[PDB]
Amino acid sequence: SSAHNAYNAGIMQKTGKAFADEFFAEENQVVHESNAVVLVLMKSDEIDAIIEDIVLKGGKAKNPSIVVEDKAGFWWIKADGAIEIDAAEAGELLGKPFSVYDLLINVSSTVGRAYTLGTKFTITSELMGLDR
């Protein structure tokens, strides 16, 4: 928690020769397992309310490793383990009908294992079907 989940974490802070030196280091010629998940939310009236009042309050309180970055047309979210959004909580916030399917209208991308279960959307580091 939580600097390691920043968009410009680690090697991304470096420029010029310093960046190239780490980019081409021997130990960085293989992938490194990450416990993170990345969630991309398309900016919209509904999403922006969800970001401010769910992700950045209850979400970050539950998972303090959450990082949210403003990427002009979308919100970029990275966290350890899992991110969850309850559409039923979002519907209460928005005051209008809002099933888990309506939530997905502006869920633009996922790096990780994503699923819906009831009113909840989850993206998780877990490898379901392989993990126990």
Binding site: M12, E33, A72, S109, V111, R113, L127
Partner: protein, 515 residues
């Protein structure tokens, strides 16, 4: 009975129907895939996004209404279609139309996955994906359709489905997210199209690019592309399920790492230079260095969250990754030399890096100024932009021994004498035909599978022909029949014509004649 009934208001929710889909299939002897595959493992997986036909349509239509509202009402009233930096509006001719064919071939790939899936839920999930790739084909078309209506240069936005056939960068596009998706093992598509294509490269190609569009004044492409990628959640989830089937069966797992490595190399070979070139050279305002975009999305996040996590279950970091990271740093600058040098064969107007761009390139890629920068500046001095100059850099490359070759496998151009990315030229004769290969991974593919890789390249088709003739024949002109769609600058004056091209006297050689 006839008087008494529960009159509580009820309907039937999508998941209530979805529960019964798995029982919709029945057993019979011929009930098996029609497509060739090495993968014969148990694959009765569950769908992660329960959808039925009625709910599929409700979701997508709601997405559409908001998108077209923004496009046809709000952004048109703002005149946003012509608030785009010329370099970027020119770049979206290529990005949107090239992605369109990737979307179009993904329809076909997804049908293969549908045909090779054995579980009714998986067949149901792959149908939804087939429909999405149709949506994405029309969305990509709609971007260029919209630009054709509202942007200051409709030429090339308005006819790429034929004018793309003139140029060499289009050949590589037909492999990377097209033939590579649909021409091979059908179950393997869950590895190449989904585990690599969707889970790795659509993020920078479709999501990250929207920030470059915004920086350059284009709010059309974010509106559409960000909606496109909302369908990708289901697609990645579809492929992951089948990858789990394969990982769980030892007889199928013995093929997985090889297919993954080939898929990764095949896609990165084109995606890495071409998108880096379009981002950094087809922009005025740059969001970040391409190599950082690639590091974030491809190496660190995809590589760590998908591949690194699956490493717990025998999936290997692609052996080609080191070669790929070299491409991520320099290959898009190599490609830029070929792109600018052969500009008359494209359908977009290009801009040499200005002084502020050059300083940006050298700060973020030390060494760029003394190599690429010096070349672009010499070309400018020689009249790169001036239609009366008679100067086209492809001839200049040949006059200085900087031959351009086409990879028989990937179709990516290669200039061995100027390249800093991954590559070395291998020229073989087989059965009286010469072939140029450019890296260890494609060379293996061609040596083992020569009948898969018989693609004609531009030099073989255009050999001995004069450049303006090829361009005229392929309709690479504006509505006056004379002025080229392609241009070496983005200004409104001094546009090049076929006569201006003909004056340079550029004739296509046989690059392998010297071997």
């Amino acid at each position: 009975d006839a008087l008494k009934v529960n009159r509580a208001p009820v309907g039937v929710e999508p998941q209530e129907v979805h529960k019964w889909l798995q029982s919709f299939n029945w057993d019979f002897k011929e009930n098996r895939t029609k497509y060739p595959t090495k993968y014969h493992m148990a694959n009765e997986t569950k769908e992660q996004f329960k959808v039925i036909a009625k709910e599929y349509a409700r979701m997508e239509a709601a997405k559409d209404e908001r998108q077209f509202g923004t496009l046809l009402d709000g952004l048109t009233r703002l005149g946003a279609g012509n608030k785009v930096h010329p370099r970027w509006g020119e770049t979206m001719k290529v990005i949107s139309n090239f992605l369109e064919v990737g979307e179009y071939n993904a329809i076909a790939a997804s049908a293969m996955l549908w045909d090779s899936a054995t579980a009714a839920e998986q067949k149901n999930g792959y149908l939804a994906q087939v429909l999405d790739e149709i949506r994405h084909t029309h969305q990509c078309a709609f971007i260029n359709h919209y630009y054709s209506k509202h942007y200051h240069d409709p030429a090339g936005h308005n006819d790429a489905r034929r004018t793309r056939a003139i140029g060499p960068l289009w050949k590589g596009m037909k492999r990377v997210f097209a033939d590579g998706f649909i021409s091979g093992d059908a179950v393997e598509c869950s590895v190449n199209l989904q585990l690599v294509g969707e889970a790795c490269f659509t993020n920078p190609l479709i999501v990250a690019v929207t920030e470059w569009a915004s920086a350059n004044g284009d709010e059309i492409t974010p509106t559409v592309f960000l909606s496109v990628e909302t369908d990708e959640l289901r697609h990645m989830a579809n492929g992951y399920q089948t990858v789990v089937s394969i990982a769980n069966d030892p007889a199928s797992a013995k093929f997985l790492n090889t297919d993954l490595n080939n898929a990764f190399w095949t896609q990165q070979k084109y995606f890495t230079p071409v998108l880096g070139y379009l981002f950094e050279y087809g922009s005025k305002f740059k969001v970040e260095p391409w190599v950082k975009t690639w590091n974030r999305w491809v190496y660190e996040d995809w590589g760590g969250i998908w591949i690194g996590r699956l490493g717990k279950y025998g999936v290997e970091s692609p052996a080609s990754l080191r070669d790929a990271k070299r491409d991520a740093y320099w290959a898009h600058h190599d490609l830029a030399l070929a792109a600018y040098a052969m500009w008359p064969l494209g359908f977009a107007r290009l801009a040499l890096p200005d002084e502020e761009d050059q300083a940006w390139f050298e700060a973020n890629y030390p060494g760029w100024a003394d190599h690429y920068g010096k070349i672009f500046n010499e070309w400018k001095k020689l009249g790169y932009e001036d239609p009366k100059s008679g100067f086209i850099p492809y001839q200049w490359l040949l006059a200085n021994g900087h031959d351009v070759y086409i990879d028989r496998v990937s179709q990516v151009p290669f200039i061995p004498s100027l390249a800093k990315g991954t590559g070395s030229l291998r020229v073989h004769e087989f059965n009286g035909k010469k072939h140029s290969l450019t890296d260890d991974w494609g060379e293996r593919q061609w040596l083992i599978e020569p009948e898969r890789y018989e693609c004609h390249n531009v030099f073989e088709q255009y050999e001995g022909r004069e450049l303006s003739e090829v361009i005229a024949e392929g309709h690479g002109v504006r509505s006056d029949g004379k002025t080229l769609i392609a241009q070496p600058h983005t200004r409104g004056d001094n546009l090049w014509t076929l006569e201006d091209i003909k004056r340079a006297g550029c004739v296509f050689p046989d690059p392998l004649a010297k071997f």
